[PDB]
Amino acid sequence: GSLNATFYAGTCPNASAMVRTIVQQAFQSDSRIGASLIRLHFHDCFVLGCDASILLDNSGSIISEKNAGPNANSARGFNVVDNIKTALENACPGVVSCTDVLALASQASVSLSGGPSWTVDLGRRDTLTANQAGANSSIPSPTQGLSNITSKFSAVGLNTNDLVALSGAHTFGRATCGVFSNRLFNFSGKGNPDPTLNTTLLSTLQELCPQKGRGSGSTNLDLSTPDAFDNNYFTNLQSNNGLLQSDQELFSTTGSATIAIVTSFASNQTLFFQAFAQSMINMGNISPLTGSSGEIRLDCKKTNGSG
Numbered sequence: 001g002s003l004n005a006t007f008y009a010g011t012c013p014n015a016s017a018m019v020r021t022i023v024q025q026a027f028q029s030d031s032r033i034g035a036s037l038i039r040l041h042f043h044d045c046f047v048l049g050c051d052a053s054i055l056l057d058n059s060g061s062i063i064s065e066k067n068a069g070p071n072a073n074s075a076r077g078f079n080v081v082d083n084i085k086t087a088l089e090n091a092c093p094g095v096v097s098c099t100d101v102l103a104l105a106s107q108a109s110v111s112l113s114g115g116p117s118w119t120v121d122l123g124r125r126d127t128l129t130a131n132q133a134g135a136n137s138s139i140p141s142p143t144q145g146l147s148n149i150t151s152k153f154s155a156v157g158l159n160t161n162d163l164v165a166l167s168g169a170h171t172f173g174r175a176t177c178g179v180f181s182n183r184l185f186n187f188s189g190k191g192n193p194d195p196t197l198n199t200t201l202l203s204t205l206q207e208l209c210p211q212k213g214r215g216s217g218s219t220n221l222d223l224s225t226p227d228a229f230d231n232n233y234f235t236n237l238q239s240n241n242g243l244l245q246s247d248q249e250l251f252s253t254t255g256s257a258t259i260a261i262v263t264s265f266a267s268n269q270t271l272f273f274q275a276f277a278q279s280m281i282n283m284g285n286i287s288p289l290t291g292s293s294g295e296i297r298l299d300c301k302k303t304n305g306s307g
Ligand SMILES: *[C@@H]1O[C@H](CO)[C@@H](O[C@@H]2O[C@H](CO)[C@@H](O[C@@H]3O[C@H](CO)[C@@H](O)[C@H](O[C@H]4O[C@H](CO)[C@@H](O)[C@H](O)[C@@H]4O)[C@@H]3O[C@@H]3OC[C@@H](O)[C@H](O)[C@H]3O)[C@H](O)[C@H]2NC(C)=O)[C@H](O[C@@H]2O[C@@H](C)[C@@H](O)[C@@H](O)[C@@H]2O)[C@H]1NC(C)=O
Pocket: 002, 003, 004, 006, 007, 010, 123
């Protein structure tokens, strides 16, 4: 419905700088926050479009996406999002959508982490509903395999190029034992660890995530540069060092078109950065609410009139 770069030009011209300022503050105490923030945009877009559905808390009317499988005890940064919103509301009351906040924060997070900048498209509007069931089914799982994951991307209009570049977001941030422990001991019922997992990594992960353990351990998505936004994620894959089954599958899946793309990104960081920016824009374009559909939420946690 034609999101555009200049949507707030009249009404909140400095929105981008303001978001960036808050995200930078946030980074001061939490190295992980930029990663968590971009993930929220991803999880937002993949369920009923980039409509801030994910942000909504439980109520009598709302069964929160926060409780969905991919989100529960995993998704994070909601308080920081509130802090960004509070700044915007103070400068430009009633203007900037939560859906837009997520898009803007994503760019700030990458740029602040040494990554590329891109021109965020704006004009999204905030949903009055959540779709927990959609979150359970629409969002890719790390263990469902590349074909299913690729279908899930297609399903929202994102192609293989998009999939590989976007997977590059795993260049920063963290993962809990449970999302990758299937690799560790009895992979795919084989009785052995995933052979595509670098044995050096395997050994440390095994210690981190003991087989009859509680699963509290957490580690870096990118063992090379856990916080910098760079192409090391791709180089890692070349060395069997991708963390998630879904990560490594991009390189190790015999005959996958993904392999050449990863190699290309591994060779040329600039190329990866350019592709990542375009892909972020593409993801950001998924099924927006626009015009007078939806609302501008005053508090991202709640529909207007609920708090
Ligand atoms: C990026 O996306 C933005 C959102 O779509 C664009 O801005 C919107 O642009 C429209 C105009 O096309 C703005 O609409 C108006 O809103 C005011 C009230 O707030 C109305 O009074 C006004 O209506 C009168 O003018 C009409 C002519 O346009 C008459 O036909 C009408 O009878 C009235 O006399 C008008 O309301 C629009 O009228 C036409 C309808 O088709 C339309 O449904 C109705 O909304 C709108 O306010 C604005 N939204 C925001 C948040 O700014 C944006 O467009 C550019 O920037 C704006 C500010 C305008 O200057 C546009 O002319 C300009 O193209 C766009 N930017 C780019 C580069 O694409």
